[model samples]
Target: HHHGSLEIRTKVGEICISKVWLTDEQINKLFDRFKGDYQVVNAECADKVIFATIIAIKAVKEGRSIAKTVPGEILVRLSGNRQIKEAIKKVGAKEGENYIVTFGENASALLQKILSTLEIKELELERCDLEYAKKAFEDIA
Candidate 1:
């Protein structure tokens, strides 16, 4: 039903930066600073990645610089899978770690919610293209 996957490897240490989202200001700030056509910021913090994913999706919808936006697009394409939630849950259960996954709604719905909550009326598109983008995710297992 979804379009992403979560790869969990067993480790002896604890996991850090489980669940997160970037503020509107932070999102815009990063976009402004990163001049590259594609950008992907990965950290032990999952929220940073989420923020990057949102920005990429927005950039694509707006017909922004494709060269600079590929990283974010790649994120959404790779991580936005149905099995991702399941994988997280299974890993958390086995590892006894606290992992949080947000976005109770679908991609478009979540995008709309984020955009409205952020009061970003300037960026408008006919569709979020999230479903189409999600097609990039494939089942590894």
Candidate 2:
């Protein structure tokens, strides 16, 4: 199968990333189905998004998650805020069209589900916003 695939090895598990095009309805469905493990951030900076996501995953494994779920934690980490709802405003998806940075243990599988059962197009990560990635490290540092 020619499935879009990318995996990062970690002590906890393989963390998967999938850049995707999502609609508002699909976003709703995503959250409802994954229940927060499948995190999705806006496509502003791939570096920051990936960095935040990796950190979030490591943080979650230690039982020190700021939010209830990995997905929510990703938002909070990206926003560098203690508030989940508030963080969502800055990094979460919006109405209509969206380019998404998705990460989780089964993130790509979920994307596969969406592709099979929904209308999501898995995109390629071409570059990283180095500044944005550095910002995440600075904030977390």
Candidate 3:
């Protein structure tokens, strides 16, 4: 729903639900109701949103509670910035005056670490609540 309005577009048998300014309560409720993992997307957002989405999706897929997950310290990517040259120089991660942080070297490793942690956490949770997580994965898959 928007600040003052809500719209639902329907075509054939498809209904598109579009909303603006989702409330915290709405987001939490949606998250709870969705049996499968989900990630929120925004049209006007920075690249950090991609990382955030990936992290959230991974955590959800692994059956870990998002509120309990802790983000790891990972290398920053320098792309799509006008002052990238100066920023790379400032960070001392320069390659021909351009920052060169490889995805596999930085982001991927951090993601892997998080995934591993989530897996372990899921395993622990499964020991306690197998049916819930098994059903969740079934829905996600």
Candidate 4:
């Protein structure tokens, strides 16, 4: 669990991503794929395909969603029912930055607010759909 790390760079900063758990078998498989090198495996496995669903579901339960700007700003919804204006103010998210919010059960309206604020025309379906998420962590040893 948490055996590997992933890093994504953005205009503002670098995002560190990792699974909460990864079984021994899975780690060994990745190791073989990377020639027995953990570093290579960690670097190659950092795609959004791994953690989107976990983040989305977690957001739903917390009564909020996670959002990342093109500039690499991470925003977390804190309260149960607050307008985007309030949430932004609370978090002080900058203006005119394109942002993507994680999809959650009860965060659709808030997601809409974020989209409108950013003027995003088309939604990236894969990022928002749990079905598309990969179970990167499985088969515990």
Off by over 4 Å in 4: 1-99, 103-106, 127-135, 139-141
Best candidate, lDDT? 2
lDDT of prediction 3:
0.29
lDDT of 2 by residue, 6-85 (tens): 55356545555656777788888876765534667774656676667777777887789898667777788888888987
TM-score for candidate 4, please give it.
0.24
lDDT values for all models? 0.36, 0.68, 0.29, 0.30
RMSD (CA, Å), candidate 4 to true, equals: 20.6
Ranking by lDDT: 2, 1, 4, 3
For every model shown, the clashing-pair count is 10, 0, 0, 0
RMSD of 2: 8.7
Q: Give residue 66's error in model 3 in angstroms.
A: 12
Best by TM-score: 2
What is candidate 3's lDDT per residue for 1-141, written digit by digit as tens? 567765533211211111123344444553364322222222222233233333333443455622332111111121222243442233222211111111222444433343343331111111214554354334323
TM-score, per-candidate, Cα-based: 0.23, 0.73, 0.22, 0.24
lDDT of 1 by residue, 53-141 (tens): 44445555557623234443434433443343442332221211111222312434444444455443331112214553343222211
Q: By summed lDDT, which 10 consecutive residues of candidate 3 come out lowest?
A: 93-102
Runs of candidate 2 exceeding 4 Å displacement: 1-10, 96-107
Q: Model 3 has how many clashing residue pairs?
A: 0
lDDT of each residue in 27-103, candidate 4, tens digit only: 34433542210111111123332243334334444545444321111222221113544434443323222223333
- Looking at model 2, the pairs that clash are none
What's the lDDT for candidate 2?
A: 0.68
